[PDB]
Amino acid sequence: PIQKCKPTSPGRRFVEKVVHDHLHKGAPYAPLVEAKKRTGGRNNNGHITTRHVGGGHKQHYRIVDFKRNKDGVPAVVERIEYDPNRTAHIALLKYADGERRYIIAPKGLRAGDKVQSGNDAPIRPGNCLPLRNMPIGSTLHNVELKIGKGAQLARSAGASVQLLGRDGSYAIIRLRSGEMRKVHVECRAVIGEVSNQENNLRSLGKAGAARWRGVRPTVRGMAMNPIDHPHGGGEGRNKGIQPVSPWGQKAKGYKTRTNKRTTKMIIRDRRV
RNA sequence: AUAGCACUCUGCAAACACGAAAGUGGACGUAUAGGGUGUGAUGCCUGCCCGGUGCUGGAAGGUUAAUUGAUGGGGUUAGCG
């Protein structure tokens, strides 16, 4: 319903959040949780390689089953949980033999629903099948690119791709960016669309909200000195230059793709 | 600086950054995500110009590198005188 908070304080005036009353409220499933540590955007040389990263709340990693290789064994959904590592919700699955796993929760999936994976899985949301066995025209998520590697495409909240056709050994899918591309027909995908589709309707409201998520402030190149940035310098406000990055790469319209090994797998570019 | 806004790049062995390389951060993330740029709650709004510079997409005419080596011109001497 997208609640807007009442302006009892200026930092609260513009806060907009979402309720999801069906999410589990207790602790996560301990055997599938492992420790994670903050990096600060620094690599093994100790240098900053990604600016504006640091701080934020402490988080545990949730072991999510992207491969879905427990074939032929039906499972039931126990609960839906909030995952701090991503924008989608996760679903805890209990299989018929007692094992428990985590999966990306499709939209509409609730406690008590049944899921399955394999060639003969029924066509239901949350079921995992090879693209060869998927009906043409369906909407899918968690698309896998290499056989046996697991889902890589369309995993964020509200994600989905469309299966437009399947010719030869390659299926044709349209991605959310607008790109049409081929995927080998033995790669697997999941029926349905990713949950939490209202994720992008939230408003943080204040700087502290971003600080809680671990984003440090961005400083414009215009505000610097010439030694720091190509945009730096000048008396007063003046741009006087075609915009570039701190390392001199143009920022408005200049294309940066250089890979030549995967070019054959893209059939229609989305006007990059 | 900021929440909010917009443009733009990036299909994942992602773009981007560090490094001589191996490798590492991005991210144990996957376009509702990540980087760069500008503007700066909110209300009402945001007009005209693509000639210049840049960017993006065309075109296969003119010009042009290495490479290749057709011809022509000389040096030398067996011989003829």
Residue type, A172: I
Distance, in Å, from the CA atom of A220 to the CA atom of A240, rounded to the nearest integer, reads 15
User: How open is the CA angle A144-A98-A193, to the nearest 5 degrees?
Assistant: 30
Other beta carbons less than 10 A from residue A129's beta carbon: 22
How many helices (H) and strands (E) chain A has is answered by 1, 17
Is the CB of A262 less than 7 A from some atom of nucleic acid strand B?
Answer: yes
Q: Which nucleotides in chain B lie closer than 7 A to a protein CB?
A: 1-4, 7-19, 23-26, 28-42, 53-57
| CB neighbour list of residue A136: distance below 8 Å, 6 or more residues apart | A163, A164, A165, A166
Is the CB of A189 less than 7 A from some atom of nucleic acid strand B?
Answer: no
DSSP summary character for residue A133 = G
Residue type, A53: V
Assess contact for A102 and A86: CB atoms under 8 A: no
Tokens of A63: 């072991």
Sign of CA dihedral A171, A89, A123, A95: positive
Determined by: cryo-EM
Is the CB of A58 less than 7 A from some atom of nucleic acid strand B?
Answer: no
Is the CB of A16 less than 7 A from some atom of nucleic acid strand B?
Answer: no
Question: CA nearest A100: which of A83, A79, A120?
Answer: A79
Distance, in Å, from the CA atom of A201 to the CA atom of A119, rounded to the nearest integer, reads 37
Sign of CA dihedral A240, A246, A248, A250: negative
Distance, in Å, from the CA atom of A182 to the CA atom of A169, rounded to the nearest integer, reads 9
Assess contact for A179 and A268: CB atoms under 8 A: yes
Other beta carbons less than 10 A from residue A51's beta carbon: 12
Tokens of A65: 């089953």
Is the CB of A18 less than 7 A from some atom of nucleic acid strand B?
Answer: no
Question: CA nearest A163: which of A188, A198, A196?
Answer: A188
- Closest residue to B57 (CA to C1') is A271
φ/ψ (deg, to 5) at A207 = -65, -35
Assess contact for A80 and A91: CB atoms under 8 A: yes
Assess contact for A220 and A245: CB atoms under 8 A: no
Assess contact for A136 and A103: CB atoms under 8 A: no
Distance, in Å, from the CA atom of A128 to the CA atom of A71, rounded to the nearest integer, reads 9
Sign of CA dihedral A206, A210, A211, A216: negative
Assess contact for A93 and A254: CB atoms under 8 A: no
Tokens of A198: 């209202």
Distance, in Å, from the CA atom of A208 to the CA atom of A69, rounded to the nearest integer, reads 41
Distance, in Å, from the CA atom of A99 to the CA atom of A235, rounded to the nearest integer, reads 67
Is the CB of A132 less than 7 A from some atom of nucleic acid strand B?
Answer: no
Distance, in Å, from the CA atom of A103 to the CA atom of A25, rounded to the nearest integer, reads 18
Q: Which of residues 95-124 of A touch strand B (CB under 7 A)?
A: none
Task: Locate the DSSP E strands across A66-160.
Answer: 75-81, 90-95, 100-104, 114-115, 128-130, 139-141, 143-144, 151-153
Distance, in Å, from the CA atom of A265 to the CA atom of A51, rounded to the nearest integer, reads 32
- Residues in chain A after which the backbone breaks (C–N beyond 2.5 Å): none
Distance, in Å, from the CA atom of A188 to the CA atom of A62, rounded to the nearest integer, reads 22
A224 CA to B11 C1' in angstroms comes to: 35
Tokens of A215: 């984003």
Name the nt closest to A202 by C-alpha to C1': B32
User: How open is the CA angle A218-A211-A105, to the nearest 5 degrees?
Assistant: 110
Question: CA nearest A141: which of A93, A74, A89?
Answer: A89
